[PDB]
Design a protein around this nucleic acid. Sequence first.
RNA 1: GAUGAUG
RNA 2: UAAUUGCGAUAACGAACGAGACCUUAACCUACUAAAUAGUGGUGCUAGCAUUUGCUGGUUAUCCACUUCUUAGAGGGACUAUCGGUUUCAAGCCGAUGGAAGUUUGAGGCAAUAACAGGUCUGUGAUGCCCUUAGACGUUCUGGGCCGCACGCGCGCUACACUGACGGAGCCAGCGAGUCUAACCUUGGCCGAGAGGUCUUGGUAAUCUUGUGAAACUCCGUCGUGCUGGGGAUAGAGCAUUGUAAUUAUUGCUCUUCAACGAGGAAUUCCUAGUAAGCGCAAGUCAUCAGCUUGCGUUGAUUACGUCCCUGCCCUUUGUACACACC
Lengths: 145, 141, 63, 45, 112, 143, 67, 67, 80, 100
Amino acid sequence: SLVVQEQGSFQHILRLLNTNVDGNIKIVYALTTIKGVGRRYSNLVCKKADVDLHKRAGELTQEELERIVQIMQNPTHYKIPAWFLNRQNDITDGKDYHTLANNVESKLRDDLERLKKIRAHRGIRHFWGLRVRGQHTKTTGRRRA
Amino acid sequence: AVPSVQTFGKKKSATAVAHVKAGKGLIKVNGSPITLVEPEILRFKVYEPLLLVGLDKFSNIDIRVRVTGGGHVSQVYAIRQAIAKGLVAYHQKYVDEQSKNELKKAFTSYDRTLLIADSRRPEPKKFGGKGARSRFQKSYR
Amino acid sequence: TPVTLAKVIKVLGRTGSRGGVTQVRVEFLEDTSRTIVRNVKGPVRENDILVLMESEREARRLR
Amino acid sequence: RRYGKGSRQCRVCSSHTGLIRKYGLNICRQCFREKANDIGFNKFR
Amino acid sequence: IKHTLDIINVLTDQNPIQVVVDAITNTGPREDTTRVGGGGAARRQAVDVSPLRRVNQAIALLTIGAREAAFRNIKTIAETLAEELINAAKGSSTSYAIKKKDELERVAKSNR
Amino acid sequence: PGVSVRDVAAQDFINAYASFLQRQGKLEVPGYVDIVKTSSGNEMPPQDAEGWFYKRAASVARHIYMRKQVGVGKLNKLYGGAKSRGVRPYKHIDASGSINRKVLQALEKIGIVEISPKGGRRISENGQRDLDRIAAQTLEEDE
Amino acid sequence: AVILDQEKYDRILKEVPTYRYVSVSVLVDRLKIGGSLARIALRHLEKEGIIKPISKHSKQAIYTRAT
Amino acid sequence: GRVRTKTVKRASKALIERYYPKLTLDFQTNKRLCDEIATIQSKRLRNKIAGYTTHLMKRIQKGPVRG
Amino acid sequence: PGTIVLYAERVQDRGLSAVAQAESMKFKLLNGLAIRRAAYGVVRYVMESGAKGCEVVVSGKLRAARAKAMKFADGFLIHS
Amino acid sequence: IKIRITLTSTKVKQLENVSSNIVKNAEQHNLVKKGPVRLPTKVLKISTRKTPNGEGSKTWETYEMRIHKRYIDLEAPVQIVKRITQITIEPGVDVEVVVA
RNA sequence: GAUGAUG
RNA sequence: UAAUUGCGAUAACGAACGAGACCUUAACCUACUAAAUAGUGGUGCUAGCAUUUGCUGGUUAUCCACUUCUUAGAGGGACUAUCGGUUUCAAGCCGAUGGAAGUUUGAGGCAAUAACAGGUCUGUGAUGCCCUUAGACGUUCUGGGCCGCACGCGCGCUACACUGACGGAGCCAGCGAGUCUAACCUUGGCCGAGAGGUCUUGGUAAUCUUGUGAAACUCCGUCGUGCUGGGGAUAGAGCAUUGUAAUUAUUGCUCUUCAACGAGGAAUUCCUAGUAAGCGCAAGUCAUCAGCUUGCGUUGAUUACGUCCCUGCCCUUUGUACACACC
C-alpha cells in the first residue's frame, strides 16, 4: 500500500487501430472501445503482453502500446488458444482469424452478402429485415425502426 | 461415571444437541471454540447465555454442541437455547433446587427463547397463488 | 407558539367516514378539571398524553 | 415409436393426451379420478 | 445501524442512541388531517395525532429520507442516515424529516 | 494445550497457508492458470492472477481435513455458483472439473493427500503435520 | 482526478488532519479524487499515523483525526 | 367464538339431573366421570361436555338455575 | 395355470348395497317399467330391509325434449 | 437360522394384527429377535385439475396412498420357520422373508 | 340533500 | 356468536339436511413398546498437536450398553380450566398467571334446497338424431402448419445499481424421485477451458445417488456516479449433447457484437404473520427444451385489530305499472 507521484507526460487519449481510446480508464477495460476487443480478450492480452494491469490506460509507454497492438493483431502467434478467436475455420480460406476494428463490420456485411447471393433462407430473412433466429414476431419487436 | 446431562433446542428446522459433563470450562460448538461461530454479526447471541448468568457458573463444566438442519440464522438460535437448557438440566440433577430456580429467573426475565422454543411454524401454499396467502393477479379485460 | 398537553380519560367510539378517526375525552395536565372532546388520527388508549396545538376547539361528531 | 407422445396411450381409453405416468400408472387424468377409490388413492387434505 | 452509530459519536461526541431518541421526538407531527365529505366532494379536516403514531411516522420519514439520498449518490447508506439523524435532532430545516413535519402541520392549520 | 486446524478461523488459515505454499514453491502450477475461469457460472477470470491457484490449494487442503473423503464431484458442488443467464432467472451451475482435478493430483505429489478406499481423497499423516504446524503459527501471530 | 501530482498530493497531507470524520466518500467530495484512489490514500495515511481508525469494514471505512 | 352448541348444552344438562351427587367443582374429576357415565366418541367432545358441567355446578352453588 | 382360483359367494344383506340396487333399476327400466314405479320400488325394498335412508335420482329425457332431475327418498341421510 | 421378515400394507390395523401375531407366536417359543422396526411411512401423491375439459376457475386436487413397511429379525431352527412362513395370511398385507 | 342518459 | 351458534320470547309442538361434531396435517411428552436400514456413549485398533488423567479425528465385519436428538404404534394433553372485570346479569365479551400450545390453537378435506338452456359429443367401446360410408370425413405413409407479422390486448422473466456489479474464501434445508417386457438416479478414477467423453461402482431404496456442501447470504478485495465493470436484447463465428431427421438457429459451451431501459400517464392487482416480499430445490410435462403449474424449505419487515365512503354479501321493514324479473 503506497502512493506515488506521476510526471505530466500522461496522454489523455491515444489512437490504436485508428480508434481513440480513453486514458482515464483502466487498461483492462479501456481497450474494449476497439471493436472486436471485449472484456476477456483485453484481460488476456495485457497479461500475455506483460503489462501492469493496475495502471491506467495513459500510463502505458509507447513501446508498451505497440506491444499490445502486435500481440492482439496476430493472437495465435503468442499462444492465444485457438478458441478465443472470434472467427475460426473461415469459410473461404480455412485459417483462424480474430477480427479487429473496421474489419468487424466489413466482414459482417460480407457474410450477409454471401448468404443473399446464395439465396438461402437466412439471406432472404435479413433482406426483409425480420428476426432470423426463429423468434415469434407476432407480439414482439414492433417499433424497431 | 462422570456426571452428565443432555438437552436440546430448536427454531425452524435447526436442532442443537448439547452434551454436558463436569469439567474445566470447555465450551465448543461443532468441534470449534464458541468464539469462531458464524455469521460474525450474530455472535453475541451465542454468548448471551454465558453473560446473563456469569462466566463463573461455567468454570466447572464442559459443553459440546452439534447442530444440524435449518439455515445460518436459525442455527444460532438453536445453539444458544441448547446451552441455556443444558446448564439448567445440569443444576436439576447435581445441584440444589434454589440454584435452578434463580438461573431460570435470569433467562426468563431476559428472553423466553433461551428456554422455550418458538411456536411459529410455516403454513402450506394453496393453489391459485405464489404463496400461503398471496394470489395471482386478476384481470377483467 | 406554545403547546398544551392533555390526557385521555375515555374513548367515545370511532368516527370518520372510513373509520380512521377516534373520539376522545382529554384532561389537561395543568389546571385540571377542564375536559374537552376531540379527535385523534391513530391508535389511542386511556392514559395517553396528547400534544394539542390549540386548546379551545371541540370536535364535531357523526351524532 | 421408440419414444414420444404416440409411443404411449391410456391403459383404459387409449387417449394420447393428459396421460399420467408417475409410479407407472399409465392412466389418463380423467380416468384416474373415477378409479382412484378402487386403485387406492384417497382424498384426505 | 452499527456503522451509523459509530459515525454519530465521531461527529458529535454525544451518546449515539441519545441522538436517535432526540431526532424521533422532534419529528413526530402533532397535527394531521383526514378526508371528509359526502357524495364525492372531498375536503380535508384537522385532527390530532396519537402518541404511538408519532413514533411510527417519525421513523418512516427518517429512513425514507436517508434512502432517497443514498440513491445514485456517492455517500454510502450508513452516512446519509447519519447526517439525517444529526440534523433532525438539531431541529434543522436541512433535515428531510423536519421539512416534512412542518409541511404537514402547516396544511393542518389552514384547514382547521 | 496443542492446536488443531479447527481452532483458527477459516479466512485467517486460508490466507496464511496460501502464502506459505507460494513461498516454498514446491507446488505444481498447471500453467494455464492465466487463461481459464474457475467455473462456467463466472463471466471473468479470477482477479489475483498471481496467487489464486495457491489460494484454491489452501482451501481444499483444509476441506479434506474436516471431512473423511471427497472427490472431484464434491468440489464441483462446493465451489459452484449461480449462473446469470440474462433474461432468464438463475440456476446452480457446477464448477470447473479440470481445475479441481489437477489440484487434487498436485496435492499428492507434495505429499499432503493420499487416495483412500471407498473412493475419493483423504488427509494423509504428512498432511496433518503440515497443516497443524502452520496453525500454531497463525495463532501465535495474534499480536 | 486520477493521477495525483505534487499539487494534488501535498494538498492531502495539509488538509486531512483537521477533519472531524474521514472516510472513502469524504475524501471524494472535499477534494476531487475518485473512490478508488480515495481507498489507497486511506490505507496510506493510516500507515503514517495521521488518522486513527474507529472500525474497519470492507464496504465501509471509518476513521478520525489522530490524537 | 366460545359459544357451545346444543349437542354440548343438552348433554351436560342430562348429566346434572342424573348425577349431581357425584359431580364436583373440578374439571379433572368431571373428565373421568363422563367416561364412566356417558359414551362419547372423541376426546375433544368429552372435554367440552365436562367443561360445561363444571360451569353449571358453579352456577348451582350460588343459586338454582332455570332449566 | 392352476395358481389362480375363482370362487363365488352369495352376498350378505342384498338390500343394502348400492351397486346391487342400481343394477336392479337398470334392468327394470330397460324392460319398460315406468320411471316412478321403479324408483319407489327400490326405495321400498331398501327401507324394509333396515336401511336408515335411501335416495334415488333419475335424470335425463324423462318425458320430453328438455331434461330434468327427479328425486325419491325415504328416511334421512347425511351429506358432510 | 437367521431370517428377516419384511411386512408391508396400505392399512395399519391389519398390518398390526399380523405383526403382533408374529412376536407373540415367537415369544411363546422363547426365540431371540429384534422387535418390530417401524420404518418411516412413505406417502404418494397425484395432483390434478378437477375439471375434465379445461374451463372454469383453476382448481386442483391432491390424492394420497400410504405404505407402512416393517421388518423383524429372528433366529430359530428350520422346523419352525417352515410354519412361520405359512401362518398369518391376511388380505391387504404383503410379506417377504429373506434367509441368511 | 354535487353529478349518474341508454339497451 | 365465525355461524338459523346459543339466552330467551312465543299459535305453535316435536323433527330432518346445512354449520359444529367429524377426518387429514403442524406444534409438546427426558412418560409406554422397539429400533445399526436412525442415532449417542464406552471399550478394542489408530493419526495429528501437547504431553499430568488433554483437544480434534479415523476404524461397517471388532464388540457392549442405551433411546435426549431420529422413525413409527398405542396413548396423554386444551376444556378458554383457574383468577379479576363487565351485561335483565343468561348466552357471552375484556384482561391476567400458568402452559408446547388460549385469533374455533394454525392449515385444509368433506359440504345443504333451488338453479345456469355456464364448459366438454376433441377423455371415454358413454349415447339420441342428422351426415358420411371406397376417385371415404375410415386407417396409415412422406412433406408442410398450428411459430407465419402494419398493429391492440391478458398472465409473466430480466432490469433501470453502491442496500450495488465483479473475483476469491466462508458455508447451511425440507418436501420428493430413481432400472421388464427395461435401461433409471448416479458416486469414484482418468481426459478436456467448457460443454461433455470414457472405465468402473452403489441403489428395485431410513442402506446408494443424498449432509441433495441449493440461492439469497456473510468475510476480504477490484470498481467509483460516468448508459458506467448496471442491462444483455439484437446479430457473426466455432465446439458439443438428445433424436430416423433440428434449416424457420430444440437446448448447452466458447469468443465477438453490447440496442431499449435514468423508477414509469390516466388506470389497476395481491396481502394482516413465520404472513407480504426476496432466493432457490424436487415433482408434473420429458429423448430433448422453463420465462409455466403443484409443493418445499431458507431470510423475514412496515401498517389496522377499524368502517360502511366506493364495490359487493346476509337478515327485517317499506314502495313498485318489474316476472325475459333495473341489462
